[PDB]
Amino acid sequence: SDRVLQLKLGNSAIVTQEAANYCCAYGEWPNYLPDHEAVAIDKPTQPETATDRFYTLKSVKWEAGSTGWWWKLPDALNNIGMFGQNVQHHYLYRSGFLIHVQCNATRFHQGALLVVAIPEHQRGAHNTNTSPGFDDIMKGEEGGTFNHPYVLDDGTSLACATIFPHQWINLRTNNSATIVLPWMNAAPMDFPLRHNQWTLAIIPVVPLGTRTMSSMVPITVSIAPMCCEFNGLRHAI
Amino acid sequence: SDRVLQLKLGNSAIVTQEAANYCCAYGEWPNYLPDHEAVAIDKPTQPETATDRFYTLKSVKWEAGSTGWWWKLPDALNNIGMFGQNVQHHYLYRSGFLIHVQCNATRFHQGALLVVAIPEHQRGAHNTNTSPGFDDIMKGEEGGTFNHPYVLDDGTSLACATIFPHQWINLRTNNSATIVLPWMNAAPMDFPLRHNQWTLAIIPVVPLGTRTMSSMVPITVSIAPMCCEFNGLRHAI
Amino acid sequence: GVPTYLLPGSGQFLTTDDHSSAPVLPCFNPTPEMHIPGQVRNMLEVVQVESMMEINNTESAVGMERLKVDISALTDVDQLLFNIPLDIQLDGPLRNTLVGNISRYYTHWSGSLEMTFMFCGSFMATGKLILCYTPPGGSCPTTRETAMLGTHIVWDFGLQSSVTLIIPWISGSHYRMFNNDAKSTNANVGYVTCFMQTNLIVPSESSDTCSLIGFIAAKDDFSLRLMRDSPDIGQIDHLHAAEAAYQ
Amino acid sequence: GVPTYLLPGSGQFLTTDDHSSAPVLPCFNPTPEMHIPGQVRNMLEVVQVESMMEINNTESAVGMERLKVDISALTDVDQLLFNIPLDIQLDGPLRNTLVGNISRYYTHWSGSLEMTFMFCGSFMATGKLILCYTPPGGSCPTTRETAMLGTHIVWDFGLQSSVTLIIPWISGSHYRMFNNDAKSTNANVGYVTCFMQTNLIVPSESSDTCSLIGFIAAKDDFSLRLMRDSPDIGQIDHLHAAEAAYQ
Amino acid sequence: GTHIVWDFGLQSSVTLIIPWISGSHYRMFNNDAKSTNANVGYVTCFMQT
Amino acid sequence: IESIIKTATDTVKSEINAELGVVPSLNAVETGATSNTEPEEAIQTRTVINQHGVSETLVENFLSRAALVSKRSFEYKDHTSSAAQTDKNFFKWTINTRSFVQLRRKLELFTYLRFDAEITILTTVAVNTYMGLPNLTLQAMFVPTGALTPEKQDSFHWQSGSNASVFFKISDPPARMTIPFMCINSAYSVFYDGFAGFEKSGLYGINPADTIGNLCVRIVNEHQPVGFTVTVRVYMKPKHIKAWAPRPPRTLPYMSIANANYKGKKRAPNALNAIIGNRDSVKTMPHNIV
Amino acid sequence: IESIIKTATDTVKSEINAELGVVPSLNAVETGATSNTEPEEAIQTRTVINQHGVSETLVENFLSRAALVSKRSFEYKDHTSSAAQTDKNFFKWTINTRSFVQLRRKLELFTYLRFDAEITILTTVAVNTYMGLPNLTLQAMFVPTGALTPEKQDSFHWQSGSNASVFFKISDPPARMTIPFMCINSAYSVFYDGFAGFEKSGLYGINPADTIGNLCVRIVNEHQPVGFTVTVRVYMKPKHIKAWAPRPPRTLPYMSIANANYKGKKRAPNALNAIIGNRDSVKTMPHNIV
Amino acid sequence: NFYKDSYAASASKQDFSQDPSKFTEPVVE
Amino acid sequence: NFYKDSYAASASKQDFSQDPSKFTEPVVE
């Protein structure tokens, strides 16, 4: 009853048959910006079915010495579809996200994934006092790999990362995880090219293991923006 | 509708056919001094049609290297007509002013005039620490010329001089400007020979230019006192 | 008696405290209030009055030549005439304005601005311009194709010799800072550029070079807060005759 | 005037005093409040979220190997798999938890805890475990006979891959202390041990070593008081670029 | 474009609705497959995982 | 029309507007009026409920800041063999607001001001070896313009039969008292386009009604065997403020306290011929994003 | 559902429960939810009326502690022949909460904070022979980010025409004033996954809205013949606190104030590969009762 | 304000009346 | 609080509303 799920957004749809109950982050659902919280006075564009639809990132190979993967939002979508064109032509954006993470294997495989969405994941670098530069943070669509996922690459702890909106993909139980993210900012709208607000982290807490034949197990991420507004129309940079 | 205007005061009248909407300074109109604000207890003389009438100053020639012109009120009128005789025979005066500035040219001329009435224009001298003397301030009917009109000859800025009651004579648009000044003093009445309260400044922000024949373009100032009272009757000095 | 105890902050002199103090002249009767024209009760009344931009803040522009922009006839289409840096805190064309000087007494600001441009050519001079406001994020647009994709107004010269370019409040949160970093995401406003929409066409007896005067005010949704000292005045010595006040 | 007198404690600066002080910016208007998701109004909301125990806090367990316990098939019955030290104050498996870090800002605590164990083997892996909580007073129980005489749960693996071992609040008075003496009668909580109830039976194509992840949260009868500094952070020098804040 | 992501399992079938997305009301069975009044589009399948 | 404004004005949503005869973006600067073009009339807006308070730009809050108006170090010692121009344990100060330029430029944004002055006196002391700092008693006597100022430390004008004195120590909090609105006019003249007397050799720009009086400050203590440097700072906070007829702010540096004379800086910014610092051309953008 | 909790929840008595289909102890961690298993559902309970108040774990009480944010010793003497990097009777401080790690780790338990800052300034002095401790007057002027900070002790930025200064002595109680919530956003960003400017060479992790301003502190006194070491400590108490989106606490030691870089300790505890100190085996009990 | 003079009181920061039209629209129509 | 600004007041320690279910039960059913 909570294991089958169809997520229809736009011209996209995802069915899954081994799901958990999906996660609404902090009990919140995405909405458009109301008038008593609006700041920018020009009329926003709301390209509803053109941008509020699933976008599927490149799959990553799930291996024995995997540390973990991360994508920063909206940086992982700033060059994809009509979401990316609205990002490049406008100054302000505001959206929630519906993240669906896919990973399946056989009933002889084991492994657990912590699929966690981290708000304002300011990263740190290891064994230096120089801050992480622009190319170390803005990885784009491909995302990055965790250097030290045990501390979440910021001196904190992976053990306490369940305070953040998360699910698990335990291969014994399910093969997908779904997190519904609202707008998470101290600001109503934001400049999407210099600020990331959600980091989707996907972490091998229990590694992949089997004794049957070794197929490739990938992990696929489908991200749907939800309730996109855009202000400040200009040329594309 | 706001371009034709007839200003009838006393036995004087001015018609203009290319005007703007005229300016009432600070939203105020001239009146006589009421009893709850009166100080001097003797009965004032109110020489209504004899003094509340236009007085036309000498025209100034509007040239290529003009910096600007200024007249201080009531000093520009203290020797003219029955206004000047009431000034010299009395100790106190109180009046508003109706300034009309005339300047016309052809439809092939260009140029813009900032016609601004400045309250309490305490002047400064350039490149010295000696204060301006009596002859540098009290120019009388002829008025003075701006030394450095870009700073309004007081270290301030010409750019912000639109905070003061002003109009423009843009030769493309109009050929006259009209400012109606009320009584502007911290005092109810005042000694007219040692204190000036309004300075009419007329400034070439865009200089005079044409490529047709070079006629003389003058600028003429007609000033009508309004609601004159006079107290403290004595001999003329 | 009353048992009291002194708190931290007792005996300090904060220069922004709001208390009652001892009158030095008891039973003094002040001068009665008179109606004086032009009373200001809030400094946002002053900020809404338009005042001249120095768009021509260049060398060989001396004094009042800095207050006007000279446009001429062009033989190429779609050409840039001028651009205006919207950096109020750093020293640009908006600093010596009524909206510019009063805002430099504050750190945070918000609300819309309006740019007014008065054409001061002859009556026979005709022309069309396009005044483009560009939100931040990229470079300043140099071609008319790039610039007109943002907020703009197309202006025909004529009987009404002025347009208003409303610069809308387009920002992330509520306020912007007067930071010395002009390129910051919380301080950069954007760019205003002007192009020939068609051309300045004058006859042979009109002057072939015409002038624009640029004005800027603030609207009534404008706001200022976090008051600071102004950078626009300073001193390193005493003023003249300030020793004579002690003699 | 009012006759007053100063009490003892006048002019002191207690760092936990609760008074009003002088505003440094008069008539400042703050930014309007916006709805932000995830507001915390009491730190006991955070303490009730489960977080991973490091039961495998051993050498040769590097990084994330410390967060899981590997169980295998055994050839002897009733064997001990792991035990968990319930000492929160001293550095054990419960220190780096949400219930562990927030409680080390406090001296006294009370209420029930819940341990959750997720089995992360294959679907084909079957097994039964017994998770025993033992009240204090004796040694930690090494055999299953001794351990199951206390609070326990017997867990069959399957479609629901997790159990909760409620660790009940069983104490003399209302609170326990975070004393450095772990063996004190006012600080010792007891022991949690896990045994094979039957065995881990896997087929030949499943991985023969399966993992448990241990979680711990607090219940809603949980309480904390007597706030103190945390032992979990410290410094002996200045941080880098902290001198640049003065330059 | 229009897609469906399908997980294998207890329900062994999905439906890809190909929506009527056309200029006017009808399309022709023209021998020119590349005509603007006859071409329907494409259906492709990929490995999602 | 006069109304009460507590927050900034809201924004109404607007639509496509294509109407003949109605040009809200066209204006007439020649009338002297500021543009009335709304953001709803120039671009297409949304509804924004604006909650930004306008209370910090109030003229009371803009001007009620305690600012420095006076500052004298004077040697506190035995002055039996000193010069004729030295401060022999006392000083006089003709009260003005034109000596320190932060308060001067702020008050000169207006033509007329009516305010009560809240005066704060902050005395500090330094040993002129080191043996300690004495808790000295100071007397600040307010002498109006028209009375006699003292010529000694121990003169008999300091008895203050009618002049208002304040007696305060260095170890105390600073001495604070309020001076009322003391002008003979209904407002102070910040600028005075006129001459102070009836003869033609008066002072230009200084209205005698504007001057508060004198502030004579002495040390009541007799001298110690060692000398000290006593610095007295006076801070003025305007309050109960009414302001009239706002003015362009001063761009050039001040030269004197007695007049509005101007020299300007040598190069831009704030020069005589260039108030804003220069750029390369009118189509050059200085802080351009690369 | 949001409700008001003043004490911890009570316990209900329970009985033998042997019902099919109902497994309260079985849970699904894969959903992301915490276990809902009650103590009444796992073991057999009694009725306990729980009177333990929950008011000390309030986010107001957890964060309204006055904690040290700044600390400077600076030499108070004649500085006419000193270096270029020394504090010549004054210092500036870019205000942050990230220099001292007790307050830093506590504030970094949250993603967003909205609070008023109550600033307490504690000045102490030591003779740099001994002759006594002077009661010196200090000025702490609050310079916002955007204004000019002073370059001297006796510079003319200290007159504070609009900047808020506090003047306080060492013998007084400590100077205390409240700084409001001064962010341009609706909350401070404790963590900022972004870059501060529009060019790609900005600073990572430092939102410019988060910075309060500068805190310029000088000694108003002129120098004595001897020197002194004046230490100024600044204490911040957050108040009127709203907090959002709690975070994992930092386990590794901080390296810098500018970033979240991590090295870890060399061995466990709080090492990069071992946060908890090691034991012998997973079935080894360290504090076992013998 | 325990002082007997009314000018001794604290600063009066509650005067929210505006009239920008005496500076922005000083025209007669 | 004799100060005219509302942020000058003492700490407000009477906010006993909780919602643990936005962190412990963030699921939709």
Q: Are G77 and G227 in contact (CB under 8 A)?
A: yes
Q: Are the CB atoms for B201 and B109 separated by under 8 Å?
A: no
Please state, in angstroms and rounded to a whole number, the distance separating the CA atoms of residues G251 and G269. 9
SS3 (DSSP) at B169:
strand
Contact in structure between A17 and A183 (CB atoms under 8 Å): no
CA G228 to chain CA centroid, Å, is: 30
Which residues, at least 6 apart from F154, have a Cβ–Cβ distance to it below 8 Å?
none
Element holding C144 (H helix, E strand):
helix C144-147
CA gap A140, A192 in Å, rounded: 12
Burial A60-84 (b: 16+ CB within 10 A, else e): bebeeebbbbbbbbbbbbbebebbb
Measured between alpha carbons, how far is residue A196 from residues A74, A96, A181, A183, C155 in Å? 6, 12, 13, 12, 40
Using a CB–CB cutoff of 8 Å, tell me whether A43 touches chain C.
Answer: no
Is the CB of H3 less than 8 angstroms away from the CB of C42?
A: no
DSSP result, F62-95: HH---EEEEEEEEEES--TT--SSS-SSEE--B-
Residue C65: burial class (beta carbons within 10 Å; 0-12, 13-18, 19+): middle
Taking alpha carbons only, the member of B115, F29, F274, B111 closest to residue C209 is B111
Taking CB atoms and an 8 Å cutoff, what residues of chain G touch A161? 248
Burial group, residue H15, by CB count within 10 angstroms (0-12, 13-18, 19+): middle
H1: chain F residues, CB-CB within 8 Å:
none
* Enclosing domain of residue A37: 1-237
Give the pairing type, strands G110-127 and F67-76.
unpaired
Bridge-based pairing of strands C2-4 and D4-6 is parallel
Disruptive mutation site among C184, C230, C237, C239 for chain G (greatest number of G CBs within 10 Å): C184
Give the residue from B142, B130, B212 showing the smallest Cα distance to B171: B212
Contact F125 G225 (CB under 8 A): no
Q: Which chains touch F (3 or more CB pairs under 8 A)?
A: A, B, C, D, G, H
Residue of chain H whose Cα is closest to the Cα of D28: H13
Structure token pair of residue D128: 């039964």
Distance CA C194, CA C130 (A): 6
Report how far apart the first and last C-alpha atoms of chain A are (Å, whole number): 47
Scanning G24-165, the segments in alpha helix (DSSP H) are: 39-42, 59-63, 101-107
d(CA C54, CA C51): 10
> Looking at the 3D structure of chain B, how many domains does it have?
1
CATH number at residue A80: 2.60.120.20
Bridge partners of residue F147, in order along the sequence: F145
Q: How far is residue B39 CA from its own chain's centroid?
A: 26
Q: Kindly list the distances between the CA atom of residue D237 and the CA atoms of D234, D240, G262, in Å, as whole numbers in the listed order.
A: 10, 9, 16
Instruction: For residue D22, give how far its alpha carbon lies from the nearest alpha carbon of chain H (Å).
Output: 14
Instruction: Flag if D20 and I3 touch (Cβ within 8 Å).
Output: yes
Q: Which of G96, G257, G286 sits opposite D85 (nearest CB)?
A: G286
Cβ of residue C26 closer than 8 Å to a chain G Cβ: no
Concatenated DSSP letters of B60-93: EEE-SS---EEEEETGGGTTSHHHHHHHHHEEEE
CA distance B27 to chain H (A): 5
Which chain D positions have a beta carbon within 8 Å of C227's beta carbon? 25
Tokens of A69: 């993967």
Q: Do I26 and A24 touch (CB under 8 A)?
A: yes
Residue whose C-alpha is closest to residue G32's, from D160, A160, A22:
A22
Query: What's the token pair of residue A122?
Result: 């300011």
G165 neighbourhood in chain C, CB within 8 Å: 14-15
Q: Name, in order, each residue with C-beta under 8 angstroms of C94's C-beta and a sequence gap of 6 or more.
A: C53, C84, C85, C86, C87, C88, C100, C216
The dihedral built from the CA positions of residue A147, A149, A150 and A155, taken in this order, carries a sign that is: positive
Kind plus residue range of the DSSP H or E element containing C146: helix C144-147
Omega prior to A74 cis, within 30 of 0: yes
Place of tokens 């016609």: B115
Q: Which two tokens stand for residue F187?
A: 């407002």
Chains that touch G (3 or more CB pairs under 8 A): A, C, D, F, I
Domain count within chain H: 1
Count of CB atoms situated within 10 Å of the CB of A47 = 15
What region, left, alpha or beta, does residue A140 occupy, with left being phi > 0 and alpha being psi -120 to 50 degrees?
Answer: left
Q: How far is CA G193 from CA A138, A196, A224, in A?
A: 10, 5, 21
C74: nearest Cα among C196, C173, C238: C196
C96 in A contact zone (CB under 8 Å) = no
Structure tokens at D178: 């975070």
d(C-alpha C151, C-alpha I5), whole Å: 40
Query: What residue type is assigned to position C68 of the chain?
Result: K
Which backbone phi and psi does G68 adopt, to 5 degrees? -70, 130
Coil/strand/helix, residue A40: coil
Mutation for testing the F interface, residue in G130, G167, G195, G201 having most F CBs under 10 Å: G167
DSSP string of D131-193? EEEE-SSSPPP-SHHHHTTSEEEEEE-SSS-EEEEEE----SSS-EE--S-TTSTTT---EEE
Alpha helices in G64-185 (DSSP H): 101-107
Q: Spell out which residues of chain G touch residue D47, defining contact as CB-CB under 8 Å.
A: 57
Q: How far apart are CA D34 and CA A34, in angstroms?
A: 11
Answer whether C140 touches F (CB < 8 Å). Answer: yes
Residues in A whose CB is inside 8 Å of some CB of F read 35-36, 38-44
Q: How far is CA C217 from CA B90, C214, F57, F159, F282, in A?
A: 44, 10, 16, 56, 21
Q: Are strands E3-5 and A12-16 parallel, antiparallel or unpaired?
A: parallel
Largest CA distance in chain E: 42
> Interface partners of I (3+ CB pairs, < 8 Å)?
A, D, G
Does the distance separating the beta carbons of D7 and C5 come in below 8 Å? yes
**Dist. CA G60–CA G237, nearest whole Å:** 10
Return the number of other C-beta atoms located less than 10 Å from residue B156's C-beta.
24
Q: G197 in contact with C at a CB cutoff of 8 Å?
A: yes
**Cα–Cα distance, G272 to G265 (Å, whole number):** 7
Q: What is the dihedral of CA C167, C173, C174, C178, to 10 degrees?
A: -70
Closest CA to B185 of D24, D69, C36: C36
What does the DSSP assignment read for D34-60?
---S-EESBTTTGGGS-EE--TT-BTT
| Best of D7, D14, D33, D36 to mutate (most C CBs within 10 Å, chain C) | D7
Neighbours of I16 (CB within 10 A): 16
Please give the single-letter amino acid code of residue I15: D
- What is the rounded CA–CA span in Å between residue B109 and residue B169? 12
Among positive and negative, which fits the CA dihedral F147, F153, F154, F159?
Answer: positive
Q: Are F66 and C12 in contact (CB under 8 A)?
A: no
Sign of torsion over alpha carbons B155, B157, B158, B161:
negative
Rounded-to-integer distance, Cα D112 and Cα D221, Å = 6
Cβ-nearest to F246 among C40, C54, C138: C40
Question: Quick one: closest CA in D to H2, which residue?
Answer: D1
- Range list of H helices, A36-155: 48-51, 81-89, 134-137
**In Å, how far is D122's CA from the nearest CA of chain A?**
5
Looking at domain G1-290, its CATH class is mainly beta
Residue type, A59: S
Q: What's the start-to-end Cα distance of chain I, in Å?
A: 47
Residues of chain F numbered 241-270 and touching chain H (CB < 8 Å): 246
By C-alpha distance, which of B55, B48, B101, B103 is closest to B76?
A: B55
Measure the N-to-C terminal CA separation of chain B; round to a whole number of Å.
47
What is the spatial distance between Cα C169 and Cα C133, in angstroms, rounded to a whole number? Answer: 11
Largest CA distance in chain C: 94
Which member of G6, G61, G178 has the closest CB to residue I13? Answer: G61
State the Cα–Cα distance between residues D60 and A142, nearest whole angstrom.
33
The answer to whether F261 and B124 are in contact (CB under 8 A) is yes
Residue H24 · residue C98 · CB < 8 Å:
no
Closest CA to G196 of C187, C178, A118, C106: C187
Nearest CA in chain I to A1: I29
C48 in helix, strand or coil? helix
DSSP character string of F140-190: EEEEEBTBPPPSSSS-GGGG-SSSEEEEEESSSSPEEEEE----SSSSEES
Q: Give the Cα separation of C8 and G8 in Å (integer).
A: 36
Range(s) of the domain holding residue D125: 1-247
Give the largest Cα separation in chain A, rounded.
Answer: 61
Residue A132: half-sphere exposure toward Cβ, Cα within 13 Å: 23
Cα–Cα distance, C148 to C197 (Å, whole number):
10
| G191: nearest Cα among E5, F45, A111, A185 | A185
| D-chain residue closest to G10, CA distance | D221
Q: Residues with Cβ < 8 Å from G211, sequence gap 6 or more?
A: G94, G95, G96, G145
- Shortest CA gap C194–chain B (Å): 19
By Cβ distance, the residue of C38, C223, C239 closest to F257 is C239
Which amino acid type is present at position C166?
I
* Sign of the Cα pseudo-torsion (G184, G186, G189, G194, in order): negative
Burial label for B213, CB within 10 Å (0-12, 13-18, 19+), is: exposed
Number of H helices, E strands in chain I: 1, 1
| Burial environment of residue I28 by CB neighbours within 10 A (0 to 12, 13 to 18, 19 or more) | middle
Work out the burial of residue F211: count CB atoms within 10 Å of its CB; fewer than 13 is exposed, 13-18 middle, 19 or more buried.
middle
Instruction: Say which amino acid occupies G29.
Output: V
Give the nearest chain G residue to C135 (CA atoms).
Answer: G198
Sheet containing B166-170, strands listed edge to edge, beginning at the edge strand earlier in sequence:
B144-145, B69-73, B198-209, B110-119, B166-170
Alpha helices in chain F (DSSP H): 39-42, 59-63, 101-107
Q: Which among H19, H21, H27 has CB closest to B21?
A: H27
Q: Number of CB pairs < 8 Å for D and G? A: 308
The amino acid sitting at D10 is: S
Resolution (Å) of this entry: 2.8
DSSP 8-state secondary structure symbol assigned to residue G253: P
**Cα–Cα distance for residue pair D224/D174, rounded to 1 Å:** 11
Task: Return the CATH number at C227.
Answer: 2.60.120.20
Can you say whether the dihedral through the CA atoms of A101, A103, A107, A112 is positive or negative? negative
Residues 6+ apart with CB under 8 A from C39: F242, F243, F244, H19
Domain total of chain D: 1
Interface test with A, best of F7, F10, F46 (most A CBs within 10 A): F46
Residue numbers in E near A222 (CB within 8 A): 5
H9 close contact with C: CB closer than 8 A:
yes
Terminal alpha carbon distance of chain C: 49
Please tell me the distance in Å from E26's CA to the nearest CA on chain A: 22
